[PDB]
């Protein structure tokens, strides 16, 4: 047992936080004491208050926290089998989830490699790509190409394809692998951009294993949207120059952008696909990398004879079982209508912010709404402002944005957007 | 799904650790339950109870379905499944960090949670690199280790795995080129330390850290070495200003007969990794610890923060079960328990020394190893162990067990007996 003041003291002395310091934090983290449905209970001024989880706890809690169908799924699997090692053994949660995932992902993705986090699945995807070409007799095809503004995780190979500014690649001189970056993909469809991308790829094609991109929505590198037709062009470019196509859908997966997977907006299939954040409905760390049969078999007929990867908790029965329920719960409802209503709620709620002086853009894609500002957002002001309106918001750089749980009612969206609009109002003054 | 349906889905759609698709010499065995030290597996259409001699890849130290860990999981499930750790903190993270800081080797004061051992190793290297950049020495960017080690499957972690065990021939031009000392011997030889120092001297100015598994090298070959090499590593790292990283992902939480294997030598590293048994084998979770000095130096450096933050960082569910797991270990007389486990393994395995295909028998804590004169054919060893009521997973030429701590004397003798028979069959044919 610990009181919130003891939690804060232990935290200050011993807990790293994401991209944080020890002992140089501008403001203490806020003690969370509960989380239920779309709502978190936080400690402000020593008192518990309920606020909306407008971030879905970093894209994860698509069905809300403590959903009874996913609680029960975890409690049911807990009674039979917490976990078994996946070396030499298999089980029902893994098979059911793999069945579900191959069926609902874009066509052609037939095999599923489970891991523990999104960064790992990305490295698994890269390893798949590199082993694929070795099994084709082309070990020179070993670099990655991407477009600027992306984000793919914090492990060192993943870092190498993150946006060089967002990723502070200047601080990693002579450390990261040197990958090929095309310019920032634009919002509106411009075929000249795809032509330029093709030309740059063409001169690297013989050393490129793969193109890796987030489809439609670029999350942590800047909450930028692009026309899905760009994905159509990458597919055709990759096919023509014999470079594999990897879609990182770790933030876009499972309905978040209006389609079940963002690749579906373009009607295109990658050779390799990563999923993660929402996979367990925000309960537990789990990820997966999927590839075509051709990739699977080429790796397996490779001289190495196998994919050299195997996380200790691979295909954890507890995380697979809740993920099964999370996916079935999503497919078991009219999810497409649900996201459309959420998008319309966000569009209506944030429209006020366009006319505000400090706002350069307001954009919505499925259950994602963004207010882009003309200067950094001072969190020391934005966080108390949103809390006083009962909304948990976490701006970064010049972005005030939300990815709310799918269960948010119209009133809760209106509360979330009103808080975002007000945060943007204070950016001016 | 039935076992047969699971088998069909699995063969079609699941990757397994370091495996192929559709080229598996053996099918996986369907596991349907796990309780205490026992797995329920399906063999010839029938369920059987077998001992989990591997502890499900060295994780299930308290056995499966321990009431204390089950309840800690359901209790946390009732209040809060997960919140984002960016901007927020919570009780299971604070308690777990206070626990780990208090029981790890002295001076390890800060805790970075992540979701797997591989990621925690990348976090450690990132800490070491950002540390020296904080000190104005950004040329200290390489790693040194001794051959025979294993540290995970992500690409930085791969770079310090044994260049044969990790098939580094298959990963040249891709992996960072690290500094490898020869295989550390089992008996203490002061000359090996002298040569290690001499090699490290020729690289000090480009070395960020020495990274080793302490006392026991797990996946690279279940090799033991004398603890006093860790004393020499500590002193050499001290005099040459190279940080010391201990990877205790396999050795932590009592496995080798001390709480952490570093304690066999009284040594404290600068950075420490833990993972496998951290949650008692329930959920994926890992932690990287470092000293106040490393943390304060990173935090005062150019980035002002450690450049890392996993989506599920400090997952309340995983942390809560780990709290229970660590407290359950601390609140019993674990040292006597592991001492008794080790005696049972030693007495039970002694008879294998005389088998013709056996080259060594060695025990260290709750770890027992029969080294054979040839690679062990899993198609012979697996059914033969299952015939004896034991789940065994040999690799390379090693028949070994890492049994759950709750194994009674008779269960240990049942485990060692199956291992002895497996080794007897190796020299038969
Ligand atoms: C779970 C949680 O609460 C959480 C909060 C924040 C968070 N970050 C912080 C900002 C980071 C960032 O901008 C960035 C870093 C490297 C490359 C690029 Cl392109 C962008 C991205 C991750 C991760 C997790
Ligand atoms: C969050 C994220 C990752 C990394 O996921 P982790 O589980 O934090 O490693 C990778 N790619 C994308 C697109 C993401 O949004
Ligand atoms: C098992 C292990 C790892 C990898 O942990 P994962 O969770 O499987 O990534 C790393 N280092 C050591 C010493 C290990 O035993």
């Amino acid at each position: 047992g610990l009181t919130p003041e003891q939690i804060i003291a232990v935290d200050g002395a011993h807990l790293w936080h994401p991209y944080s310091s020890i002992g140089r934090e501008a403001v203490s983290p806020v003690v969370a004491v509960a989380a239920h449905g779309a709502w978190l209970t936080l400690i402000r001024d020593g008192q518990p208050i309920e606020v909306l989880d407008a971030m879905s706890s970093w894209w994860t809690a698509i069905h809300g926290h403590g959903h009874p169908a996913l609680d029960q799924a975890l409690t049911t699997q807990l009674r039979v089998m917490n976990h078994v090692m996946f070396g030499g053994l298999t089980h029902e949660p893994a098979a059911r989830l793999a069945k579900l995932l191959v069926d609902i992902t874009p066509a052609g993705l037939d095999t599923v490699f489970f891991s523990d986090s999104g960064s790992v699945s990305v490295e698994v995807a890269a390893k798949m790509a590199l082993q694929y070409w070795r099994g084709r007799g082309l070990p020179g095809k070993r670099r990655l190409m991407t477009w600027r503004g992306g984000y793919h995780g914090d492990t060192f190979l993943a870092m190498s394809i993150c946006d060089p500014h967002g990723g502070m690649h200047s601080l990693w001189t002579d450390v990261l692998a040197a990958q090929v970056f095309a310019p920032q993909v634009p919002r509106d469809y411009d075929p000249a951009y795809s032509a330029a991308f093709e030309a740059q790829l063409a001169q690297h094609a013989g050393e490129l294993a793969a193109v890796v991109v987030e489809p439609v929505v670029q999350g942590a590198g800047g909450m930028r949207f692009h026309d899905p037709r760009y994905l159509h062009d990458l597919r055709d470019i990759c096919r023509r120059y014999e470079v594999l196509l990897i879609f990182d859908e770790i933030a876009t997966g499972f309905g978040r952008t209006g389609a079940l997977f963002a690749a579906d907006h373009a009607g295109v299939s990658p050779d390799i696909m990563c999923v993660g954040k929402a996979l367990t409905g925000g309960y537990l760390s789990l990820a997966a990398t999927l590839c075509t049969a051709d990739v699977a078999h080429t790796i397996s007929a490779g001289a190495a004879g196998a994919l050299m990867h195997g996380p200790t908790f691979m295909a954890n029965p507890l995380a697979c079982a809740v993920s099964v329920a999370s996916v079935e719960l999503l497919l078991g409802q009219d999810w497409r209508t649900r996201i459309t209503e959420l998008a319309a709620g966000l569009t209506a709620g944030l429209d006020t912010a366009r006319a505000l002086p400090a706002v350069t853009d307001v954009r919505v894609c499925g259950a994602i709404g963004v207010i882009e500002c003309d200067r950094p957002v001072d969190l020391a002001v934005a966080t108390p402002a949103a809390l006083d309106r009962g909304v948990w918001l976490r701006p970064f750089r010049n972005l005030v944005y939300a990815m709310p749980p799918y269960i948010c009612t119209p009133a809760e969206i209106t509360q979330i957007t009103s808080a975002m609009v007000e945060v943007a109002r204070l950016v001016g003054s």
Side-chain angles (χ1 to χ4, degrees), chain A residues 1-23 25-43 45-421 423-429:
Chain A
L2 285 182
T3 73
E5 294 185 22
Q6 293 172 308
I7 300 178
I8 291 285
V10 170
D11 182 278
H14 307 295
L15 282 168
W16 292 99
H17 281 263
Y19 283 78
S20 95
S21 79
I22 304 279
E25 292 301 275
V27 282
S28 294
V30 169
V31 181
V33 296
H36 291 96
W39 296 81
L40 319 171
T41 313
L42 313 181
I43 300 304
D45 305 318
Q47 167 169 98
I49 56 179
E50 276 167 334
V51 312
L52 278 165
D53 191 354
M55 318 309 285
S56 294
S57 291
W58 208 238
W59 309 82
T60 61
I62 62 179
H63 298 301
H65 304 263
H67 195 288
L70 318 188
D71 279 11
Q72 260 170 65
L74 203 58
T75 304
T76 295
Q77 182 67 39
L78 193 57
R79 273 182 277 125
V80 193
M81 189 169 74
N82 59 343
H83 179 73
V84 290
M85 71 191 274
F86 216 47
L89 311 166
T90 193
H91 49 79
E92 187 172 353
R96 285 179 81 209
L97 186 53
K99 189 61 199 117
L100 274 157
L101 288 183
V102 301
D103 282 331
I104 64 170
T105 53
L109 298 161
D110 289 5
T111 72
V112 190
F113 189 113
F114 286 109
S115 54
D116 52 274
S117 60
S119 287
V120 177
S121 72
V122 170
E123 307 234 334
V124 160
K127 186 176 290 175
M128 272 172 181
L130 272 64
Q131 275 192 250
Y132 176 85
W133 292 114
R134 289 183 142 276
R136 304 261 320 250
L138 296 165
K141 284 175 85 55
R142 63 183 186 103
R143 307 177 74 190
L144 300 173
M145 182 178 177
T146 197
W147 52 32
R148 287 177 173 271
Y151 176 71
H152 301 284
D154 297 333
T155 55
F156 276 85
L157 186 146
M159 292 169 63
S160 87
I161 56 174
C162 291
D163 182 73
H165 297 110
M168 317 291 171
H169 286 189
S170 56
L171 314 180
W172 303 104
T173 301
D174 309 311
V175 178
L176 299 169
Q179 313 287 20
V180 183
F181 290 84
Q184 174 62 52
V185 58
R187 159 71 150 248
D188 300 314
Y189 182 67
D190 181 358
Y193 177 87
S194 301
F197 193 106
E198 176 175 341
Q200 181 182 17
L201 179 146
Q203 75 176 74
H204 296 287
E207 47 167 12
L208 284 176
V211 170
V212 186
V213 297
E214 307 153 274
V216 184
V217 174
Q218 288 182 309
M223 304 297 298
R224 289 187 183 81
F225 314 152
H226 54 262
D227 195 286
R229 192 169 178 181
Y230 282 126
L231 308 169
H232 185 90
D233 293 343
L234 293 187
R235 173 73 283 171
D236 166 71
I237 288 165
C238 283
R239 172 190 298 128
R240 285 190 285 109
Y241 289 81
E242 284 183 296
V243 175
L244 293 170
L245 184 52
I246 302 176
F247 280 166
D248 184 346
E249 296 230 28
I250 290 167
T252 61
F254 303 92
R256 171 62 71 182
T257 79
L260 200 48
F261 293 101
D264 296 337
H265 285 308
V268 84
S269 272
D271 299 281
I272 299 173
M273 188 188 173
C274 307
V275 292
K277 289 191 163 70
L279 175 58
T280 60
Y283 276 68
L284 287 171
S285 62
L286 187 66
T289 307
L290 295 84
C291 67
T292 68
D294 168 58
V295 177
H297 296 84
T298 306
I299 298 173
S300 300
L307 179 55
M308 309 311 310
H309 208 109
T312 304
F313 283 86
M314 179 174 196
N316 171 240
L318 285 171
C320 287
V322 63
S323 172
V324 162
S326 186
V327 171
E328 285 174 339
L329 177 70
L330 183 68
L331 307 177
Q333 61 180 284
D334 182 7
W335 64 268
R336 201 178 303 257
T337 296
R338 187 80 276 272
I339 295 308
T340 299
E341 306 178 355
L342 284 150
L346 295 172
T347 308
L350 299 170
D351 171 71
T352 303
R354 291 188 186 283
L356 294 177
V359 170
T360 56
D361 190 40
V362 182
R363 52 187 176 266
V364 166
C365 192
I368 305 167
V370 180
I371 304 180
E372 183 175 347
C373 298
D374 70 8
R375 73 201 83 181
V377 190
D378 173 30
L379 281 84
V381 154
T383 323
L387 292 178
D388 297 9
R389 319 207 161 218
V391 173
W392 168 249
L393 270 178
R394 174 101 160 154
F396 77 123
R397 308 200 302 258
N398 64 333
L399 301 175
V400 184
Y401 68 104
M403 320 75 84
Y406 299 175
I407 60 174
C408 288
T409 69
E412 300 172 333
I413 295 307
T414 301
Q415 186 174 354
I416 292 169
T417 62
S418 170
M420 289 161 69
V421 169
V423 169
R425 189 178 317 280
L426 302 151
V427 170
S429 70

